[PDB]
């Protein structure tokens, strides 16, 4: 439905909502100022994170997380979790004795902020390490690239 679908009022703590809206100004509509930040490392915040209305305390841009540690990339596998997706990272493991490699993978649950809308299965995402967001979540999506998509017949 609306934004406030939870039992408590979802809002950004840094943003103060009631700035004494009185008769000296028209009411309204005074759109609420949006809190956002650049996460550094050259990643540019999306315009959905700039002008959106969602609230996500685990969002890299509009939430209380800081990206530090490792930056990895993966391929979106499933999108059946609330604001989190699982990505698959495929790599090769060297076996010295046989001088050959071993195709391995490791599924990784990552948080996907609502600022990324055109995210589908198979897209290549990059994730950054953050503080533990859940039991098995320690990475947050920073940038999404499509995979031979964007041409829907």
């Amino acid at each position: 439905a609306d934004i406030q679908t939870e039992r408590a009022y979802q809002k950004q703590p840094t943003i103060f909502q009631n700035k004494k809206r009185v008769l000296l100004g028209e009411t309204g509509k005074e759109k609420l100022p949006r809190y956002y930040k650049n996460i550094g490392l050259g990643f540019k915040t999306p315009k959905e994170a700039i002008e959106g209305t969602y609230i996500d305390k685990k969002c890299p841009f509009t939430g209380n997380v800081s990206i530090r540690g490792r930056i990895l990339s993966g391929v979106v596998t499933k999108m059946k979790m609330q604001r989190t997706i699982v990505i698959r990272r495929d790599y090769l493991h060297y076996i010295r004795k046989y001088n050959r490699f071993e195709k391995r993978h490791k599924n990784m649950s990552v948080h996907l902020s609502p600022c990324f809308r055109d995210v589908q299965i198979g897209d290549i995402v990059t994730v950054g390490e953050c503080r533990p967001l859940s039991k098995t979540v320690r990475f947050n999506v920073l940038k999404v690239t499509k995979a031979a998509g964007t041409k829907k017949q």
């Binding site: 550094g40 490392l41 050259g42 530090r68 930056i71």
Partner: protein, 262 residues
């Protein structure tokens, strides 16, 4: 372990102490101080194994409790006090002063200095911040903090300070061309000139330093410390001038010395 460790194994001691492996099971285990234990000299080994003034730790204890060992202008009675980098060990009874500078092999060798030189000591600005009432505070490479520095001194700069006051005498800005010394890793104890610095956000920045023999190496920013302005050092360099020479070169030096002295 259920708490902090207060024992150091002889074989687990840092290699630059050059401790042997048969005299004892344990190592001096330097006490906590301004320097990390992995790159500090306990006074016990500095007096026993380096200068051979004392023969045992008991004799080091006697000379320390005789109040004849003064470090950075303050008398230290601690046997396991971390002497650390470029600090001044002063024995006024003998009138002898030393500054702990690494050699070309990356070890604290004895480097005697003049009394008019021992009164001051350079320092690396580890961090800068502001405390209560807007008072700026500067934390150095030692555990020393100084209030009210000039705003032209930033992180990983250098400051020339003096003894017995702890004030700021001069400083070195971090810039290309400034002479610097590597204080950790493989290139430890090599004197050179900062030639370039590449910044890696979220990770360690890497500097490239070329010495007087044309040897250009690289080092993390955390291991880079400046001891001069451009070409002139502000500190009397130890023997060897900090140039690391190839393995054949000390062979040639040894053969020349033994031929001349034979």
């Amino acid at each position: 372990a259920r708490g902090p460790k207060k024992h150091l194994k002889r074989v687990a001691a840092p290699k630059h102490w050059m401790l042997d492996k048969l005299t004892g099971v344990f190592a001096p285990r330097p006490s906590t101080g301004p320097h990390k234990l992995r790159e500090c000299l306990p006074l016990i080994i500095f007096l026993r194994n380096r200068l051979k003034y004392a023969l045992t730790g008991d004799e080091v204890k006697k000379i320390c409790m005789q109040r004849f060992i003064k470090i950075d202008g303050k008398v230290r009675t601690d046997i396991t006090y971390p002497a650390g980098f470029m600090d001044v060990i002063s024995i006024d009874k003998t009138g002898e002063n030393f500054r702990l500078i690494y050699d070309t092999k990356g070890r604290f060798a004895v480097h005697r200095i003049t009394p008019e030189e021992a009164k001051y000591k350079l320092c690396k600005v580890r961090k800068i911040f502001v405390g209560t009432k807007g008072i700026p505070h500067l934390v150095t490479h030692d555990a020393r903090t100084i209030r009210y520095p000039d705003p032209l001194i930033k992180v990983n700069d250098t400051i020339q300070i003096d003894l017995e006051t702890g004030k700021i005498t001069d400083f070195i800005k971090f810039d290309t061309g400034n002479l610097c010394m590597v204080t950790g890793g493989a290139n430890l104890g090599r004197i050179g000139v900062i030639t370039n610095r590449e910044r890696h956000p979220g990770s360690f920045d890497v500097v490239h330093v070329k010495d007087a023999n044309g040897n250009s190496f690289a080092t993390r920013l955390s291991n880079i410390f400046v001891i001069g302005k451009g070409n002139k050092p502000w500190i009397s360099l130890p023997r060897g001038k900090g140039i690391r020479l190839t393995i054949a070169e000390e062979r040639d030096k040894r053969l020349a010395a033994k031929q001349s002295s034979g």
